[PDB]
Amino acid sequence: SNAMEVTVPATLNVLNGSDARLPCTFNSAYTVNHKQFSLNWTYQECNNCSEEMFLQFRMKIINLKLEFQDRVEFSGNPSKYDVSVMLRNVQPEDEGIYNCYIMNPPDRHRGHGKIHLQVLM
């Protein structure tokens, strides 16, 4: 009621070289209008580190192709309240914080999910 519920794993542990699905779903009393829905995914190397946007939904998916190489993919379905992303062939440098920011107009509250991705040997 006082915020948009966003469900993500607080910590996600993935083996080096495997594919990492970053799950993110949300709740809203309004359906998802692709002409107004907003999604931003950002990455940080560390807690205090600058955020780097790497994927957006604005009318459609925009993959910013950050020099992640071409390993980021969208893995969700906005109309089904799923905004997950996929990081293929995870590398040690992918360790860090992944933020999902969600707006579903006319729902007032913005959602925020935060995942700490850790890369195992």
Author numbering: 27 to 93, 95 to 148
Please share text taken word for word from the publication where this structure appeared.
The construct encompasses residues 30–153, and contains a single Cys mutation (C55A) to facilitate crystallization [The C55A mutation is located on the protein surface and therefore unlikely to affect the overall structure.]. The hβ2 configuration displays an Ig-like fold, consisting of eleven β-strands and three 310 helices. Other than the mutated Cys (C55A), this domain contains four additional cysteines that are arranged in two bonds. The first, intra-subunit bond, is strictly conserved among all four β-subunit isoforms and is mediated by 50Cys and 127Cys buried within the core where it links two opposing faces of the protein. The second intra-subunit bond is located within a loop that spans residues 70–77 and connects strand β5 to β6 via 72Cys - 75Cys. This loop constitutes a unique feature of hβ2 since corresponding cysteines are absent in β1, β3, and β4. The loop containing the 72Cys- 75Cys disulfide bond is modeled in a dual conformation. Of note is that the N-terminal region of hβ2 is structured rather than disordered in hβ4, adding an additional short β strand (β1) which interacts with the novel β4 strand. The hβ2 subunit possesses a corresponding Cys at position 55 that is located in a longer loop which may result in an altered spatial position of this residue when compared to hβ4.
Voltage-gated sodium (Nav) channels are part of membrane-embedded signaling complexes that initiate the rising phase of action potentials, a crucial event in generating and propagating electrical signals throughout the human body. As key components of these protein assemblies, β-subunits (1) modify Nav channel-gating properties; (2) regulate channel trafficking and localization to distinct surface compartments; and (3) influence channel oligomerization. Structurally, β-subunits are single-transmembrane segment glycoproteins with a short cytoplasmic C-terminal tail and a large V-type immunoglobulin (Ig) extracellular domain that may participate in homophilic and heterophilic interactions, cell adhesion, and cell migration. Of the four known β-subunits and their splice variants (β1–4; gene names Scn1b-Scn4b), β2 and β4 form a disulfide bond with an unidentified Cys within particular Nav channel isoforms.
